[PDB]
Design a protein around this ligand. Sequence first.
Ligand SMILES: [Cl-]
Ligand SMILES: [Cl-]
Ligand SMILES: [Cl-]
Ligand SMILES: [Cl-]
Ligand SMILES: [Cl-]
Ligand SMILES: [Cl-]
Ligand SMILES: [Cl-]
Ligand SMILES: [Cl-]
Ligand SMILES: [Cl-]
Ligand SMILES: [Cl-]
Ligand SMILES: [Cl-]
Ligand SMILES: [Cl-]
Ligand SMILES: [Cl-]
Ligand SMILES: [Cl-]
Ligand SMILES: [Cl-]
Ligand SMILES: [Cl-]
Ligand SMILES: [Cl-]
Ligand SMILES: [Cl-]
Ligand SMILES: [Cl-]
Ligand SMILES: [Cl-]
Lengths: 169, 169, 169, 169, 169, 169, 169, 169, 169, 169, 169, 169
Amino acid sequence: HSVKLRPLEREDLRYVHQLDNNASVMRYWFEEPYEAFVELSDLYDKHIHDQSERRFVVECDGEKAGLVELVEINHVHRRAEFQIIISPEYQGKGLATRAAKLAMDYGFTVLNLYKLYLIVDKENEKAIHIYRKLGFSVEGELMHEFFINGQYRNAIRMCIFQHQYLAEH
Amino acid sequence: HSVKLRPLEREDLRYVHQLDNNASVMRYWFEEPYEAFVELSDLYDKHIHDQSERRFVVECDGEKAGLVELVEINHVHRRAEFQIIISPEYQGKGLATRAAKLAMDYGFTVLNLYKLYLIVDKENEKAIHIYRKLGFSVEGELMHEFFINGQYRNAIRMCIFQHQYLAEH
Amino acid sequence: HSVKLRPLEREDLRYVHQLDNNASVMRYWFEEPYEAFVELSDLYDKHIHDQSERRFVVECDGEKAGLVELVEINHVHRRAEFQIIISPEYQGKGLATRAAKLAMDYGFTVLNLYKLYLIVDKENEKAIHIYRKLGFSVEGELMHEFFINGQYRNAIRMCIFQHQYLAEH
Amino acid sequence: HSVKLRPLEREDLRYVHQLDNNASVMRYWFEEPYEAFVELSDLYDKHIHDQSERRFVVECDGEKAGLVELVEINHVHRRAEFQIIISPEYQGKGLATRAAKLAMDYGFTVLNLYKLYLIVDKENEKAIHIYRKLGFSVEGELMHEFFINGQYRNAIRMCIFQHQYLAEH
Amino acid sequence: HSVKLRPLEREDLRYVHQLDNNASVMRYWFEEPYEAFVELSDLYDKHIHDQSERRFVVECDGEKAGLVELVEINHVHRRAEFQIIISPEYQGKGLATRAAKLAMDYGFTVLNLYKLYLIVDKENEKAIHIYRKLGFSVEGELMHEFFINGQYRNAIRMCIFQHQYLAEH
Amino acid sequence: HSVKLRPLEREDLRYVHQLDNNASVMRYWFEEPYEAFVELSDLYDKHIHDQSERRFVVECDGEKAGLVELVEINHVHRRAEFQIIISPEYQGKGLATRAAKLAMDYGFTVLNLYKLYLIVDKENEKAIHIYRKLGFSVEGELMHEFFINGQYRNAIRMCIFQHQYLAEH
Amino acid sequence: HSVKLRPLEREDLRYVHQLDNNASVMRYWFEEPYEAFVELSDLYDKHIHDQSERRFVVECDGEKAGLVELVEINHVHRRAEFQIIISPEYQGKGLATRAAKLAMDYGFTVLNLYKLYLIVDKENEKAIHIYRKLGFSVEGELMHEFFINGQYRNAIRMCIFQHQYLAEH
Amino acid sequence: HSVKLRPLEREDLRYVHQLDNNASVMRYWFEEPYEAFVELSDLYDKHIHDQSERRFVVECDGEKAGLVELVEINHVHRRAEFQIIISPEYQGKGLATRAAKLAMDYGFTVLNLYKLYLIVDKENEKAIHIYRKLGFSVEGELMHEFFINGQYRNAIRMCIFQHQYLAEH
Amino acid sequence: HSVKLRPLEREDLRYVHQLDNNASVMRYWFEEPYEAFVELSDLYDKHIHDQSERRFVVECDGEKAGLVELVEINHVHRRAEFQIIISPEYQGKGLATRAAKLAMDYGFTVLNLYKLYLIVDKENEKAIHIYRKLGFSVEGELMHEFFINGQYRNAIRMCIFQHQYLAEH
Amino acid sequence: HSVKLRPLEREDLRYVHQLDNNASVMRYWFEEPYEAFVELSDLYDKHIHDQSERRFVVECDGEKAGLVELVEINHVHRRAEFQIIISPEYQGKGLATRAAKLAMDYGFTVLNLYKLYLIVDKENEKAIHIYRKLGFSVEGELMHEFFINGQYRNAIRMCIFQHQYLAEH
Amino acid sequence: HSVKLRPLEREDLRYVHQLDNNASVMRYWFEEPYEAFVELSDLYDKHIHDQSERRFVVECDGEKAGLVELVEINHVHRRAEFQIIISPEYQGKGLATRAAKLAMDYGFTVLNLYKLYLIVDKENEKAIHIYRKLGFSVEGELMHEFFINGQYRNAIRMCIFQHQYLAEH
Amino acid sequence: HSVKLRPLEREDLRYVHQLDNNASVMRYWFEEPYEAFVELSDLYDKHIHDQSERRFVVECDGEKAGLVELVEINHVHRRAEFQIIISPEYQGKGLATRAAKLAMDYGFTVLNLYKLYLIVDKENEKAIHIYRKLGFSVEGELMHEFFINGQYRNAIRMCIFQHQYLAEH
Ligand SMILES: [Cl-]
Ligand SMILES: [Cl-]
Ligand SMILES: [Cl-]
Ligand SMILES: [Cl-]
Ligand SMILES: [Cl-]
Ligand SMILES: [Cl-]
Ligand SMILES: [Cl-]
Ligand SMILES: [Cl-]
Ligand SMILES: [Cl-]
Ligand SMILES: [Cl-]
Ligand SMILES: [Cl-]
Ligand SMILES: [Cl-]
Ligand SMILES: [Cl-]
Ligand SMILES: [Cl-]
Ligand SMILES: [Cl-]
Ligand SMILES: [Cl-]
Ligand SMILES: [Cl-]
Ligand SMILES: [Cl-]
Ligand SMILES: [Cl-]
Ligand SMILES: [Cl-]
């Protein structure tokens, strides 16, 4: 089974729009979930050539299976935020791990970043396990940082550095 | 039977345009009923990214059945106006109740609002009954607030708070 | 047989363009008759959202049969000019009366106007009869107000008030 | 004492803005009285090259004393509406008569119009007297055509033709 | 002592910007108080020719003393929201009453509205007294409708109709 | 056999472009013959709403057969220039006479012009005969006014007045 | 005494605007006399780089004394219309003759035109005398071609050719 | 001694531009320090009406003394980032504490936020002391999050909630 | 066999783009050969209405066979540069001579030019022979005026005047 | 087997987008690899008419096989950077040599450049061999000039002059 | 006495506009002499960044004394047209020679051109003498190439090459 | 004596424009030296927010003394080109060394670059000495890379890395 990344194209936006939790990976584009398709396409258009982001479609055996991205890319501090979403049926099969490692390879071996970081719900044990196996380490807790489904939730920030990634491939 | 909300898309505007009493839920867009289709589409375009509104199509067993929305969203005072219209054939079957509860869940569990309010004709006993069962309470009367079919009519304002909604699910 | 009004849509402009005396009901848009189709469509586009006018297609048994409109809508003085044109084959069958009554109902019961007025050729006995049966009363004569087919012609202004219309339904 | 007309210039708009009843002669520009200065200047800008209007400042012994204008100029029917406003202190001294005759001379001897018409309050005996001495004849009554200071008022339409004006100088 | 209204001009915006509680009368323009001067001027520019609002400066003995306005003007339902702010030093001297009566006279005798309404804090006994003496009647309570200085507050809606105003001058 | 005029539509420009001597009737649009199709369409677009011209297609038994037009329409002096071109195969059959009379009827009975004039080559005896039978009279000679096919040519101006046309139908 | 031409500059438009009969030499710019200053400046701006016209100020002993121009410049037919206006006080002193000869020299020796023509009132004997002395010959009469001060007037067209001008200097 | 906040005005940008460490509080506007004045003014212009930020000048005895702001305002999660910079001479005198408390009061009592957070260098003991006295608590460490003066530095995130702030005034 | 010219249309640009030596006749549009199709179409669009050029397709028995044009048209000096390119298969058959004579006829009999000139490689004996038979005479040599295929080349300028062309047909 | 160059057309961008190492030859357009298709098309559009670049598709037996280009074209110093990419399957067959020689011929025999230069990885022995056989000579080493696949790499600059190329064909 | 060149600045255009024969050195900008100042400034603005021209003011002892320029700069063929105009009072004193040598030095030593050429009237013996002393050689005669002051005139083209200029300094 | 850098402001462009060899440090903006002031200001405007460049004025004892800059900033490869120009009178006094060290400190300690490089004429021994004392090492020779004052010249590329700079301060 093959897994590859490709750039998120304007023609892929219907796919993105139909993903269940797509707002969670476009938090810096919009705050109100359930945006219209033309709202999403207009934001995409507004961000062409934006050096602070690179977004990718994850392909598995040639089918769209999710999205991975590096956002908030800061060239002075040489860091970015990593985010991923995988279609539910492709979950639990090792795809998130393989897609995440491709995006890490892009950030550290192609873009030459020093630090990658991510935010995950503190109760998402499965996700935290996957990120730890990839070399991410818990950095801190953001207390009541998100209001989700009627209550404030705690998030964990995790990070990894280029020297660690390169030393372990 | 399934009921779900989805964002009001630009391609759904022919549906909206053919609904009988569509002007009643677009009172802040236009005042003269019987707007043209291109008038409606131009207003939609002008309101992309407007943080004061979120409008949804109500789907029932995968067919368009009405519209529900939160308008006049005020982030400081944490409130919004709820409005709904259901195609006549889908009336009396419990759809308005189910659609309204989804929109309430969006306002209180997703957008984190404190207060939702609505306006209803004082003579619409069926509507008032449905809103009371959902937890709305009568707030006040707006006397001769609308000129409808040749005479001034009285409206009632109804409201519900987040603490009540969350305490009762 | 059904008669209904619907908004004049941009896609209805070919119909309007082919009506024989269409210039007579678009006197405030253009003065030189025999405008091109793109001249008419550009004017329509320029008047989207114009609160001074509402134009409708008249449908009879689901076929386009004419146009009725309220123009020069003045919100302070609460008045408008009524104008109608019916395709020739639909004339003499009671359609103008039924379409006019729908437009009157729109002006007085929906838009809340105080006064509707119209202008008619003094020699158009058939039209004057129809307007009088609808409750319009002769207001005055405009002497040599139009140059039509080679000679100046006299017009009559007719009017009706909301109180009269509402008192007689 | 000299009386002359000159074109209404953009630099004369502060004068126009401070005239007490300026809205009454700009009824086709705006309906809500008490427009802002930049509202008035933007409308002026929007009407440069508008062939339907010509507006003039009335000068008396070289001082701005009022406004006279020909609006709703229709080239097919060869007619226009005459309107005048004179600063209160310049009233009762024969200025309105002299300014009106200059504007009539412009309409009939320069623009080659066939008919000039005006609207006056039915209770304004002084104005009606002045217009009759200039050759205007009462054409008809517009019943409850204006809401002014809390009640509907009746207006009279008056008219004069080119042949009469030219035959009497 | 004279009191008069005049239109709010673009050159009056520095005055408006320095008024302490100016956000309370521009709630439909912006939500975050402490807007910049160029934010306020850009909003003013965007609302030139907006038929839904008329804003005035209140002058007392020829000095700027506050603002009064009619907003949310709805021509179909013939209603508007009245709002006023008076500079603190001009308070308690009868200016608010005199300015309010001028704005009421504008709404009912000039714009021909049917209903004027306002919102006032339930604890503002002085304001409620002034509005009652002008003929406003309490319409209803809006419960926890505003978050002000750290707590939700209750507001009262008050209204008056044209027939009452005209019958009492 | 029927002959009618209709407005020159944007979709008729391929027809106009393929007419042999089309430049001769568009002398005020362009001087260099053999303009490109997009040059012609751009000029058409630039002249929408131009009150100085009205151009028509001549139809004969429902087929495009030529062009007739009134250009340089001057509303003060109440005059226009008449120009016609007929496809060669439709020449000599009375079509030019019938089309010209329709355009004359438009200028004198619809637009209310006082004077129509035209320019014709002095050697075009056939054309001059047709214009004289329609009531045009020779006005003057324009000496060496056009350079055509390698030599200067003389033109004749011809004119007719509204009183003559109306007196003879 | 010196006489020279210079280009009509944007800063000379106040001068042009105050000339009594300036509309007579700007007939192809506007038809309604008494245009506003900003109407005139906007037309000037719209005609920058227009190859069909060249307009000049006439200077006499270094003071602005009138305007001379070549309009309707046609490069194919190598002709233009000459027009002149001289401030009244500079009339009768030989200035028109000297200014006209400079403009003729520009048309025939600089622009390389073949023919210059002008239009003059048939009753303007003084003007016709001046043009004949410059070599212009009467070409024809335009009957009732202008409506001026209440009656139709006859104009004469006059012309001169390059060969004549060059042969006589 | 008085301390007050006022909105950051476009005319205050020269002041902002000359502050030594101004880039540290405009990290979301630009990354390369030492931006030009017109770069800063263009960014300000681009952010008028941006609901995600409110920036203020700190005044002390009527003189500009620093900047305080709330950025990254998220209305769903009801949080913002607090940032402050004080001119060096105004440091150590209690101004930062007083200015910070005004900005906290704006965020919690005016904007109705739930959470405020800030980032501070881990070695800035003076700053951390001031924030702790205001009620901020250390939330977590961001490891090597900034490259400053040639080496990576560690930052601390600190936070406070509305309930705590309101309970302690 | 027929040969005719027609205007170069926007829809003919694919043909122009595929001609081998098309850059040689568009030297004033671009200098770097091998322009893209959209580069060529954008230049065409930029030159609509350019009075300095007229470009034609050469048709032979109704098939596109080359291009002929008059560029650098100067109306004062009454001259233009002639350029031609013929598809290779249509070479040696007399087409260039026939196409050139049509373009000469356009320049001298239609546009009324005084002088036509062209530039040809000094070593192109076949071309020089064709131009001499058409009446062109060698005017001068431009030494090392073009760098073509790795070396500087000499060009000859050739010219013909209108009097010669007209005297010989 | 034929090899030819043709201009890179807008319709060839899907081909360019799917080439594996396309970023390496568009380094002056964008830095972040994996640009979207609309990012690439927008950059292409922005560079139409850019005299600093000429890009070509390499065709082999009529199929797209790679890209060759001259970028950073400096007309004063008469130099450009040469870059090539060949689809992997077309590698090792002599295509790069043949395509490179066509591009060299374009730079030296068509554009008249003095110097061509290129950059190649120091470890790419195959490429360096091909460039040396074409006449390129090593100019210098750029130490750690590119970060590629996780480590800094050394590049070699190579150059050739027009005199050498022309002397050897 | 010093002579220097400096770039022609937008603020130098009043100087250029008042030079007697300025049109002769701006022949590719406009054809009709006596352009207005705003015509000249608009053309200047349109040519900012135009790589085909470089225009300079000639300074003598710090005073503007003329203009020198290189136009029609062709980077492929490495040539340009040299043109100069010197204020009349600065003529005959060696300034043209010194200014021309500076412009030659710019073309050959700075821009790296291969060939400079100029056009001069055949009867201007003084100019031809100056150009020959600078190394220009007569290239050819352009017969009746300019119409100047009423007759066609002959021009001479002169040229010089970089190798000659560099070999003689 | 103080030396400091500050951003190059739009108001500093007159200074830049008058520096003798300013083109040498703006080689990527324009190629033809002697650009006009408005050419330079337009380029500055076009590059606001350009992340590839940072340009500074060098101040010495509070007076403008030169320019230093980092251009071609590449965030992936973490490199930039350093360029400096010092007013001639400030040369030989140690200013270039002090200004260069400030710019190096900006590139390595603020922007976090890995490599800085520069180009210098091979014959500029003074410059090479200064750069070597700052830690730059010769990287390679660019042979005949610039045409300066009539001959091709050789340049040297020099470079320094962040680790070296940080290890030596
Ligand atoms: Cl961990
Ligand atoms: Cl919670
Ligand atoms: Cl209740
Ligand atoms: Cl009622
Ligand atoms: Cl009646
Ligand atoms: Cl009549
Ligand atoms: Cl009467
Ligand atoms: Cl009450
Ligand atoms: Cl006759
Ligand atoms: Cl002839
Ligand atoms: Cl005569
Ligand atoms: Cl008459
Ligand atoms: Cl703590
Ligand atoms: Cl020969
Ligand atoms: Cl050679
Ligand atoms: Cl080598
Ligand atoms: Cl490495
Ligand atoms: Cl010689
Ligand atoms: Cl070294
Ligand atoms: Cl050399």
